[PDB]
From a paper:
Coxsackie virus B5 (CVB5) is a member of Enterovirus-B (EV-B) species, which can cause various human diseases, such as viral encephalitis; herpangina; hand, foot, and mouth disease (HFMD); aseptic meningitis; and acute flaccid paralysis (1–3). Similar to other EV-B species, CVB5 is a nonenveloped, positive-sense single-strand RNA (+ssRNA) virus.
In agreement with the results from AUC and EM, after data processing, three distinctive maps corresponding to F, A and E particles were reconstructed and refined to the resolutions of 2.73 Å, 2.81 Å, and 2.95 Å, respectively, according to the Fourier shell correlation at a threshold of 0.143, which allowed an atomic model for the majority of the main chains and sides chains to be manually fitted or built in. Comparing the compact CVB5 F particle with the expanded A particle, we found that the expansion of CVB5 was largely attributable to the tectonic movements of viral proteins, accompanied by a ~5.5° counterclockwise rotation of the protomeric building unit pivoting about the 3-fold axis and a ~7 Å shift away of VP1 and VP3 from the particle center. This movement results in a more elongated structure and broadening of the surface mesa. Furthermore, the whole GH loop of VP3 seems to shift from its position. We noted that the first seven residues of VP1 visualized on A particle would traverse the capsid and stop on the surface of the capsid, which was distinctive from the E particle where the corresponding residues were disordered, and all the other remaining residues were present on the interior of the capsid. Based on the previous studies on enteroviruses, it is reasonable to deduce that with the particle expansion, the GH loop of VP3 moved upward from the quasi-3-fold hole to form the classic β-hairpin structure to obstruct the off-axis channels and aid in the widening of the 2-fold helices (residues 90 to 98) connecting the C and D strands of VP2.
Author numbering:
A (entry chain 2): 12 to 259
B (entry chain 1), C (entry chain 1): 49 to 281
D (entry chain 3), E (entry chain 3): 1 to 177, 185 to 238
Amino acid sequence: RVRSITLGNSTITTQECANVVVGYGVWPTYLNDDEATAEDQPTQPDVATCRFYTLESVMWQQSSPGWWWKFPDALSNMGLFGQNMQYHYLGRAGYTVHVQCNASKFHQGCLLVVCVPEAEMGCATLANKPDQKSLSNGETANMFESQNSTGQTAVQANVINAGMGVGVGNLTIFPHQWINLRTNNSATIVMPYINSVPMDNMFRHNNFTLMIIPFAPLSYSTGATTYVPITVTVAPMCAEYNGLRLAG
Amino acid sequence: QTRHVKNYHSRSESTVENFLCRSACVFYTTYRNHGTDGDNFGYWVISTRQVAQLRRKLEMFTYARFDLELTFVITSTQEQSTIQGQDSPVLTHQIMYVPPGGPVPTKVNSYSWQTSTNPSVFWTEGSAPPRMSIPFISIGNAYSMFYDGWAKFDKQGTYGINTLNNMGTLYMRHVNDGSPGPIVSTVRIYFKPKHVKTWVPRPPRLCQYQKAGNVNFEPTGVTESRTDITTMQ
Amino acid sequence: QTRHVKNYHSRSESTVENFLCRSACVFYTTYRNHGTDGDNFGYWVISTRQVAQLRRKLEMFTYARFDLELTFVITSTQEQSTIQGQDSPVLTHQIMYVPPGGPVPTKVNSYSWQTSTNPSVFWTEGSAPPRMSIPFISIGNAYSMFYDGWAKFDKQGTYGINTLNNMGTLYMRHVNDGSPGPIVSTVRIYFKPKHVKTWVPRPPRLCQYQKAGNVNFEPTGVTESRTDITTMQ
Amino acid sequence: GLPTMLTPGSNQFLTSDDFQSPSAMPQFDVTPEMDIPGQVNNLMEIAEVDSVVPVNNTEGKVLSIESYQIPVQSNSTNGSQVFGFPLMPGASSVLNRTLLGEILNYYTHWSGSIKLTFMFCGSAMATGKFLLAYSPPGAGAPTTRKEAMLGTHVIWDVGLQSSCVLCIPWISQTHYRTAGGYITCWYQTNIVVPADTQSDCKILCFVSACNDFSVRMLKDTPFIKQDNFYQ
Amino acid sequence: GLPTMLTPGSNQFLTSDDFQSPSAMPQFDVTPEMDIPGQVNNLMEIAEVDSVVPVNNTEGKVLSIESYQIPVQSNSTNGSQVFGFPLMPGASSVLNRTLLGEILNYYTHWSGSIKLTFMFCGSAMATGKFLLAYSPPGAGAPTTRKEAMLGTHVIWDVGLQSSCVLCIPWISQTHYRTAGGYITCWYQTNIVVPADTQSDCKILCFVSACNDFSVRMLKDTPFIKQDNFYQ
């Protein structure tokens, strides 16, 4: 049937028997004390942030290249967990990413829904670094391009290279899920916290980005809706922050 | 060529250790025995992003953790000059490893050469090439080959970069001039990762590299083109 | 820089052994193959109070007990001259350790060179650097880094000094001239304490050192100053 | 001391040597390993991952996403060829730059079985049949749908299943530095739709490595160039 | 003899080597060790000792004893700041030259918990309250007594106890060669005395190392200079 999932004061509905891609095989977990470690780096969990956050749906069209969000930044103004990023210096969390797609049986298209860790992106100008606005717009999706981007500090958003200088067709090496409208309409990726350090500043670094790239273009019969909404729902998992109390 | 042979399913050197623990030449520089203003010394900041082959092989992963086994091939050649009767004694070279955050030599006779916390190897020519090993020197848990962040958030040019991938700097100089004549030595540093751990594999780089400290790229085709999609004649 | 990382409580190299058993360059001198009046020889009285860094590290303690592992880096360079066709054979050097209270060479050919109780190492160039170890040579139970007393009570200038901290003197010379031309060699003595025991820790030195054989100091501020005691804006 | 002879090969630097080296910084405590997810021990793990194949390498398409999209014409001649490429994962440009192809181009010798997955990306109401034909090495590409039917082939029914998986047993490399096998698709039937769609259907291709690949002689990849120093 | 190869790195002098050396004076009997009190095996033992902090580093005071004395005004504005310094044991000049700071300046990397002890040195009849406020790294120094009260803080009652001990959990180093935390004091109340004393009360600060410091990369201290030979 249909399964309803509630986290805090938010509820979503998902079809049962829907595949869940669990990161690199690792479910998000809390940090573990190493043989009763001293209280020199106290950690503070937060369970109020474990709720669904629903970004504004992106309108998938016929000539529509991909979108991407950088989720440490994409949830930086979503009430809690954004206040938590602002208040705490060091943060650590995983995410459950739900990608819905509302289309009828008369719609066509395929989507690559991939979460790319450490997706450092190049600049349109070779001797430059892309700015914050182009790299991540927060809750607003940044869009890929069908041709080379132009700009002094703009991201090279041509979809063929996914902004990283690699083959876009080889993006499946990362935790991904294909959305074929004739077979699928949902994608669930559970991304564990991936970093070279146990905790890191969240304004200063993006753990991963989600790329939604239409490989097969959207198509429809005459009279059907010319666009298709793509909804991204995010539930932070196992959010930890540096303890603010005095050690003694 | 390469006729069909039996498949023995050898996965032996497809492992990350045999894939990356290859000794590659990453740097070579020249320095003279006599210098105009004490600048007759070679140096190389240890980076894995200057040679495009080793860089691509390492960037096929997101995080790495390895040791730095460095081998130096120092060869000295006598330059042409009018000085006669040189008769140079054997030449000794000093190779200093400055750890991350250590004193940096400015000239060939700076105090940073005669320090105590910078590992230095003194090698006399005619012996086996000098060899030193640097451990996993990062204070983080791994070397991040990619960094979707800034060193300082309020700085535009700090994107990427990180601060935990600093592996130190190498410094090379002549201990003795030998003769009152021109002698120039090449160091030809050879790099070899050891005990490699890698995480989060990544697609191989498709676009040619532009800068050593950038991921910036000119957009390129996903592959070479062909005349027809079908194999018809 | 140096982002927050996990604390693993490594006390490993905070120990006195890893703190002091570091090989540091304490002395370097030059001597010629030919001498005007037989004075073409180098010498160094073994003291731990000439290099201000090792001196500070050792003076962070009151009493110490260590071995003297000395390494010598001898490099010879041929000076410019009108002598032609030199063709110098390989050069041999003699490094003598005069124990406390032993005969003292006066010239390069003094009888104290060809003695029997002074340990001497003969090293030919082109080999590994010579190395000798001196035990804890004091007749007392430890080396006193500080001495609130006089060698002789009735003498003003004997304050401090002690008489049990004498570790001997090193003497360096050319065994053979090699060629009838000017050759000057640098010894570059490297010092490394071994098996260190330390007692009665002391505050680190705050005022810059003035003399090697004194504790005299120009009074200095306890620290650098700041504009305001409060962190107000 | 102990009498020894130095033996030929002493004091030499062979770059492919496994001798222990002296540590430049002993008595330094390295940070312990932390469990990062996604640890990789073998490049075959990357090779075994599905990668989208750019079958539509026609001129002007390799710079756009539609190089990966195989066009399926609604009004197409019966028995025509949809697509077809030589079955060379390292030589043919169709499979060359895929994950498996990139891994293979790092080694001189390799052999195994590739896994090809074709996904139909039309409407759920669309119905049709495709004939995926496999030609063994040396056989040559079929020229008609009947020759394809008389060889190794599968009837890919769009109406029943939207994905088809083919495992090819004889792959191997072809050179040290045709006659490799072919995979082709044919229009057994046409694509049938309830309503009029202006755009044509697309087919996505995926290539992957099976567990039986070997790689034996590492070499430099031919897809990166560095003709000058960066400093 | 036994065939051997010299191997790269032979005949080299690496200063950070642990090879056995030949004894220049063998067959000499060294004096046995005698039990001197105060044997030290680790520099953390010196680091863990309380050291007086010169909080009053205002100009003209670092050359006098009153740099260690925090002045406490009898007639001071309510809610004013008594003192405050950045919580950097190696960078800030307040904690820099203390025993813990001197030990830390010998190592590139360190992390642990510092112990701060404030001692009030007024008369036994004096009574007052102080608000010792701890700001975590990145939080910033509080500007009012209310912001200090809303964070981590202790109410130091002079009348009850003349000493206060604070353990700070997150210290660490800040550079290879702000945003480190702050500790501040505020006048919760004024100092009350029975009789008229002309001189003001003083507060002494002590810093110390807790058992959880590590030090990992020894280096030269930046507080000693030797630009020429002594002979």
